[PDB]
């Protein structure tokens, strides 16, 4: 990992979320962590079904 | 051979000349990069600005009694080069080689080092001086 | 260590990076009769200098 560097990507300044939150369709809140774990499990299971 | 035999050069070529790594179209390097062998500043406009007015120094050269030659010698890691650092960065007002790091430095700025091999080797190899005027 | 295909007794083992040593010109230069064996020339030399 020292021998082959990377030197990442200028213009990468755009991130998935910073682009995503912009839209009408995403809303922000706080929540307990374990609750986010469980929700996301339920999410996934519906997706794969 | 005999089918031609006179003017015609009948040549059967195998293998190669010009081993395959060669560029075969030479990359044009417009600027000349020294940074590989040494680290040295080539422009007239980037030479540091010497708060004592270099022009006034060159005048001292007319007075033979005035100028003096001091060498600095001592065993390994006695601090020679990093001492000449103190003198220099005292004299010059703005040095392009200072990182914000070495300016408050954890790592000593070593001005008189000047060779790549002497940077990586951690040592000083070929002797290097400086000329400057300083007030007694 | 890697470029020279050498190991520090505790260091990592890599690939040759120059897989062919096999080419050897039969020649007088390095012949034993012309060499003086003093000190073994341990690896740590070859990594050191």
């Amino acid at each position: 990992n020292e021998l082959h560097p990377t030197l990442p990507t200028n213009h990468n300044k755009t991130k998935l979320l910073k682009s995503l939150k912009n839209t009408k369709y995403f809303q922000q809140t706080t929540i307990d962590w374990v609750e986010a774990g469980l929700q996301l499990c339920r999410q996934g299971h519906n997706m794969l079904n | 051979e005999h089918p031609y035999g006179k003017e015609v050069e009948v040549l059967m070529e195998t293998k190669n000349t010009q081993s395959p790594q060669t560029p075969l179209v030479e990359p044009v390097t417009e600027r000349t990069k020294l940074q590989e062998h040494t680290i040295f500043t080539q422009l007239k406009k980037n030479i540091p600005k010497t708060r004592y007015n270099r022009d006034y120094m060159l005048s001292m050269a007319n007075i033979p009694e005035r100028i003096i030659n001091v060498g600095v010698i001592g065993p390994l890691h006695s601090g020679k080069t990093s001492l000449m650092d103190l003198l220099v960065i005292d004299s010059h007002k703005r040095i392009p080689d200072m990182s914000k790091n070495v300016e408050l430095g954890w790592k000593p700025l070593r001005y008189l080092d000047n060779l790549k091999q002497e940077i990586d080797r951690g040592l000083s190899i070929k002797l290097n001086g400086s000329t400057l005027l300083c007030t007694d | 260590g890697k470029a020279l295909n050498n190991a520090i007794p505790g260091g990592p083992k890599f690939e040759p990076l120059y897989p062919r040593e096999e080419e050897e010109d039969y020649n007088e230069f390095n012949s034993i009769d012309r060499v003086i064996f003093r000190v073994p020339i341990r690896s740590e030399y070859k990594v050191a200098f």
């Binding site: - | 031609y4 050069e9 040549l11 070529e13 000349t17 010009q18 395959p20 075969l24 179209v25 | -």
Partner: protein
């Protein structure tokens, strides 16, 4: 119609000098399909092969510089770039491969031909590629992003030979439906059609100056003005069939390679044929293997380079004695058509 025939007897065209055989270069294992020359320094060749390789020959001494492998099948066409240090090679493997001359490694692969791609030509000012082949379509490739930007629907059969021009029509194309189309790429449709060929047009060449093209067929090598698209001239040919390639010297000399092994040299202005040669096949070859697959002139135009089906490249030089003592060739006698 006789008035035209008088108007053929006034001109007495354009003396030139003969050609002869300077050098023979063996060293390909298979046939030599295509040849292109360094557009800047004239220091070398790039020659395709039937063995899939490419062997870069030095023009001066004829020595072999390097070998460029990397195609699995025979290499039908090779073209070198002017403003770029790039080399675009193309084969029967359905792929147009870029080559970075600096480090000699494949950079880019362009994708999406249905089948073997037999012509590449590098548009002069646009950083484009023009590729064509048994697809029966011409693909204008964006050199930078590898996107087949434009596709030109077109000839009813395979496309043998394609060229590029800076002004209107920017692509000239020649197909085995025996037509030659002059393309308008921005709108993406044929600007002009030239049908006068009776069989497959297997080769074209652009005159380096007059802004015209020389088109080939079995027995009749015609010329064409670009722009308006008129016929310009004809070239007198008895059966030379088949014409594999054409090349145009900067002195307005028009070369024609035969499949019968005959080298038919012309003047470009007239249509007159001042010389016809016959190559020597080879030591162990067959009389069938004697033909001329490709050919080119250097930047100057004082030498000729012809890959032949006998697995050899030959270098034809223009004689320096010549003049009027005895040059004269067939001497401009034309039979009624």
């Amino acid at each position: 119609i006789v008035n035209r025939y008088e108007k053929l007897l006034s001109q007495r065209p354009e003396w030139h000098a003969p050609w002869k055989l300077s050098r023979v270069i063996n060293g390909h294992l298979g046939w030599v399909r295509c040849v292109a020359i360094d557009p800047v320094d004239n220091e070398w060749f790039i020659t395709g092969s039937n063995d899939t390789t490419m062997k870069v020959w030095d023009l001066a001494t004829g020595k072999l510089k390097t070998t460029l492998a990397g195609h699995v099948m025979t290499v039908r066409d090779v073209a070198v770039s002017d403003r770029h240090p790039y080399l675009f090679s193309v084969s029967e493997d359905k792929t147009v491969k870029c080559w970075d001359l600096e480090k000699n490694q494949i950079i880019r692969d362009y994708y999406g031909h249905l089948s073997g791609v037999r012509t590449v030509s590098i548009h002069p000012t646009l950083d484009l590629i023009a590729t064509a082949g048994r697809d029966s379509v011409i693909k204008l490739w964006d050199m930078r992003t590898r996107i087949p930007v434009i596709t030109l629907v077109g000839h009813k059969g395979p496309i043998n030979q394609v060229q590029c021009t800076p002004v209107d029509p920017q692509v000239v194309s020649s197909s085995t439906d025996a037509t030659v189309r002059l393309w308008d790429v921005v709108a993406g449709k044929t600007m002009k059609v030239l049908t006068h060929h009776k069989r497959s047009v297997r080769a074209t060449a652009l005159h380096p100056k007059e802004f015209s093209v020389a088109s080939a067929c079995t027995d009749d090598i015609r010329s064409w003005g670009l722009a308006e698209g008129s016929l310009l001239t004809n070239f007198e040919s008895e059966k030379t069939g088949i014409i594999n390639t054409l090349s145009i010297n900067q002195d307005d000399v028009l070369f024609a390679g035969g499949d019968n092994g005959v080298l038919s040299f012309y003047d470009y202005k007239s249509g007159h044929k001042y010389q016809s040669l016959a190559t020597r096949e080879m030591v162990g070859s067959l009389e069938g293997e004697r033909s001329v697959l490709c050919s080119t002139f250097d930047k100057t135009g004082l030498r000729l380079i012809t890959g032949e089906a006998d697995k050899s490249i030959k270098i034809w030089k223009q004689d320096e004695t010549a003049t009027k003592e005895s040059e004269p060739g067939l001497a401009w006698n034309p039979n009624l058509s």
